[PDB]
Amino acid sequence: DIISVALKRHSTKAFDASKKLTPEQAEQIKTLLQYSPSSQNSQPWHFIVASTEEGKARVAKSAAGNYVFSERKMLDASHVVVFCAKTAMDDVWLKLVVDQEDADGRFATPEAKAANDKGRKFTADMHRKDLHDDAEWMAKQVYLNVGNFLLGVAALGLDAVPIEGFDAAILDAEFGLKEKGYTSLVVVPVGHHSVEDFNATLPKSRLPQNITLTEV
């Protein structure tokens, strides 16, 4: 029951480092990252999946200064996903996407492929050339991916925590992201919570719908 999943999931504050994802689960989480929807299927993202001691430690360099409380979550979880956005939308990426759709069998005719490409270029250009908000627009798609991911990992019976509390400059530098064309946005440790996870037992809290939700 997905509503049950949504109501029971929580942000894990402490992970049991001994409780790893199964091999299948580790593939499932990668599938969830890949299959998120995004505007124009633009998929403007890269993921770093850290599963080794060394790899997790590299990500954990970002939990410095104001962000030290994030460090243990990054080290102790089984798998840690760094969600990254492209820093600019380029035509090469646009072509990549449409060619992949063609390879996958989405276009019956050259005309259909060309109309798809034109539409995607129009939208991408509106953001980059006119609104000058392509970096934000791409970042929004990445956050959508995060939302899909958190629900999906809960539905697999896995714990996770989304983290904005990290130093993206440190994380980008550690992985050479800027030169590759990406920037780190959200870190999501995934695994199984320990008995020290005080948030596992605390009540969920949300604003009432009478504040947030209008029916018409």
Added chain:
Amino acid sequence: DIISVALKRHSTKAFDASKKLTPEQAEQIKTLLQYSPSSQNSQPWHFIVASTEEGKARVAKSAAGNYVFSERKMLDASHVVVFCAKTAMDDVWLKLVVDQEDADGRFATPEAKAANDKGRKFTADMHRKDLHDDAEWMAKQVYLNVGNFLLGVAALGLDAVPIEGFDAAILDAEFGLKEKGYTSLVVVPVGHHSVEDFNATLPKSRLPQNITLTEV
């Protein structure tokens, strides 16, 4: 299982106007909106859930003329959700959130409540004063909610499509959002697809993980 859901769900291109959500389903989609996570539990959002014909017509006004194909989808779906972000994170809202957390029993002591409020204020202030990205930060939380929602509604057996193809200035004006401190970001019609939904039977397409995903 949730991976089946992720692999089978799609953006619906055409809705069967006769197929309405059940009352239970209409409550469930509200539950999904409310229970999404967000940075600091800041919940910087408002939802407009249009289920009457008049209501849906008000939302569909935003697509008139320039977003014709969008317009039809918003009219035909059972329930149409407008995802809105706050335009500023005011201290009233910060207090609302922490007081709600208190009401729900998340704090053992006044000290714990005060530390929570201080933390949230610090984050909000960093975005507003230093990063100059508070509107974007809130908008990102709203996109995360959308991601959660799309997977959740698919897992309920419902069809949907996320839509950026609408005129947010028009939608904002129609509902007086600017003065209320909100702006429209994404519209999500929800219901059941019709036989005209050509996308229901097309293969999904995503870039290969060898492009988008690095393991370490």
